[PDB]
Swiss-Prot record, chain B:
Disulfide bonds join 6-11. Coiled coil: none annotated. The chain holds residues 90 to 110 of 110 of the full protein. The gene is INS. This is Insulin A chain.
C-alpha cells in the first residue's frame, strides 16, 4: 500500500473499496 | 466530518471501514 495525502481520488478510492456499494458519505467536508 | 483526518492526513482502510453509511 502507499502512504500520502488521501483527500483526493485516493480517499474516494479507499471507501470505494470498503464502502464501494455502501455509498460512503465522502461529500464536501461542510 | 470524519474524513477530516484521512483527507487532511492518512488513516487505515480499517478505520475508514466505519465511514460506510
Amino acid at each position: 500500500f502507499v502512504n500520502q495525502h488521501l483527500c483526493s481520488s485516493d480517499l474516494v478510492e479507499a471507501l470505494y473499496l470498503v464502502c464501494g456499494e455502501r455509498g460512503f458519505f465522502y461529500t464536501k467536508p461542510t | 466530518g470524519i474524513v477530516e483526518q484521512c483527507c487532511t492526513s492518512i488513516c487505515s482502510l480499517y478505520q475508514l471501514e466505519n465511514y460506510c453509511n
